[PDB]
């Protein structure tokens, strides 16, 4: 359906057929990502052109930029990065590191280079797109290619442009449901049941380097085996971790299950960390929580 | 193109009879590599394809109190496929060994996943211990009706060729014996990072690296290595420091580059290490600091 292709440089692209190439960064495949595609995809009709893209392992700013830890974090693991693109009818997509070589390329050196190496035929690229060292816009696009080259407007809603800086943010804010609302799906983070410490629960450790929601208590959806189950997520610093660790309720699920992977789906925050006073002040939060997430839709 | 992940067994695959080699695979050391080899001889009966079943992560998650120590593996994933596919796989299976799969009793695991792999010969270790129940090497006959082949434990004169001896080497700073047992020297996947230029300062520029992966990483020392950057090796210098801060364990991982004057910034490295140069030290001068990275150059391009 869809081939990721590792590739160290231009030469490892292997594209057989005229394409239309999609520019840009593409982390989580945002709404304003998918226009680019549905774009992309009313142009690869009339020759049936295949749709390719190229983009990278980890942000560019670890070539151009001090180094610090964040700068390795992703909005989507890599295989939900491909089946998002895969959903929006990439059939070639090239992984390559930003590099300094890569850095350097001007405009035209780029041209000349991945874009041929991909046999675009037609080009699309978002209003924002930026590229070269020669730091070019959009309509610049024209000039440095034959075919034909469609720059698709920027997408915003009430908030502004939906753009992958707004993600994060919403993420580290709390924010899922707004981050899932601009993604076009809700957040996906992988974890593994692990050992480790009324209502019982899971302890779950992430195993990608991708953004944690704020601290809270969200609901999801939980996925195991194939198995969607919903339940109360619980987030807190030096409460469930101290590496990124959090636990989970999952509701109408019993059954032994370390050492399995799951899917957390962000629906929706409910409330704060919060220290009570009581034991009964916490035991009718849990109560009201466990309403809140079982009927939200 | 080896590795399919699955949740079960139902996802499997295998058309056909093949040869199924049992195991836990870290490092693909050379006692794997017997098996293989045993099982390439025995493949060669009726040319049948070698698949194998290996997990994610350690058993021991499942099965034991967290620790972020559990997570650690000798390869990366991509460096797994590499070994196995050499030397001879041809599907590769990756399962979670969760709690489920803890509880299948010997017949069971047989019922499901051999049974889905088409197994007509089974090849093991002599030590392989599997299923609920613990039935071992012996005990797989009854099992299956087919030709159980068990390799003897390949021995050195240190005696058995082991994942934990090769952990334990590791963690030693003992490299050179290290990649012995592996059978090839250790890779470890770095990124190159805009870290502390110290060395660029100096006039002895260094590449920061960050590794990508969980895998162990060496003994704090001085080492030579070989580098991959672009397809290309070079011979090099790795500085390895784990120093801890409240935050947590800061690791530093150097790579001084021989004859190389590109910025690589971005890019992702390979680290192979050959052998143990020196123990860290610290420098209060220039003029110590330089001696000794002469010293440490010296020894590092004259070694083989
Ligand atoms: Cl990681």
Same mark, same amino acid.
């Given at each position: ?40 995809? =009313? ?7 295949? *749709? #390719?893209?190229?983009?990278?392992? !980890?942000?560019? @700013? /670890? ?78 696009? =024209? ?7 469609? *720059? #698709?407007?920027?997408?915003?809603? !009430?908030?502004? @442009? /939906? ?135």
């Amino acid at each position: 359906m869809i081939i990721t292709i590792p590739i160290k440089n231009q030469k490892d692209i292997g594209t057989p057929s005229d394409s239309v190439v999609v520019l840009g960064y593409f982390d989580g495949i945002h709404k304003g990502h998918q226009e680019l595609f549905r774009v992309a995809n =009313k142009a690869a009709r009339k020759d049936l052109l295949p *749709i #390719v893209v190229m983009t990278f392992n !980890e942000s560019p @700013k /670890i070539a151009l930029e001090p180094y610090h830890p964040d700068l390795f974090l992703h909005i989507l693991n890599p295989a939900e990065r491909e089946r998002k693109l895969k959903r929006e009818g990439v059939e070639e997509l090239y992984l390559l590191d930003f590099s300094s070589q890569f850095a350097s390329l001007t405009a035209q050196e780029f041209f000349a280079t991945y874009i041929k190496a991909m046999n675009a035929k037609i080009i699309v690229a978002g209003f924002d797109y930026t590229f070269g060292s020669d730091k070019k816009t959009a309509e610049d696009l =024209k000039n440095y290619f034959d075919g034909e080259v469609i *720059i #698709v407007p920027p997408v915003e809603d !009430e908030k502004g @442009k /939906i753009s992958s800086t707004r993600i994060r943010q919403a993420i580290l804010d709390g924010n899922v449901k707004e981050a899932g609302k601009l993604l076009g799906a809700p957040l996906p983070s992988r974890g593994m049941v692990v050992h480790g410490n009324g209502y019982p629960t899971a302890n779950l450790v992430l195993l990608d380097r991708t953004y944690m929601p704020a601290d809270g208590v969200y609901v999801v959806d939980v996925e195991i085996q194939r198995q969607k189950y919903r339940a109360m997520a619980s987030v807190g610093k030096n409460v469930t971790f101290d590496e990124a660790r959090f636990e989970v309720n999952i509701f109408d699920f019993n059954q032994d299950i370390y050492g399995e992977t799951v899917m957390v789906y962000w629906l929706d925050r409910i409330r704060d960390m919060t220290k009570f006073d009581s034991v009964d002040q916490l035991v009718d939060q849990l109560k009201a929580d466990e309403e809140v997430t079982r009927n939200w839709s």
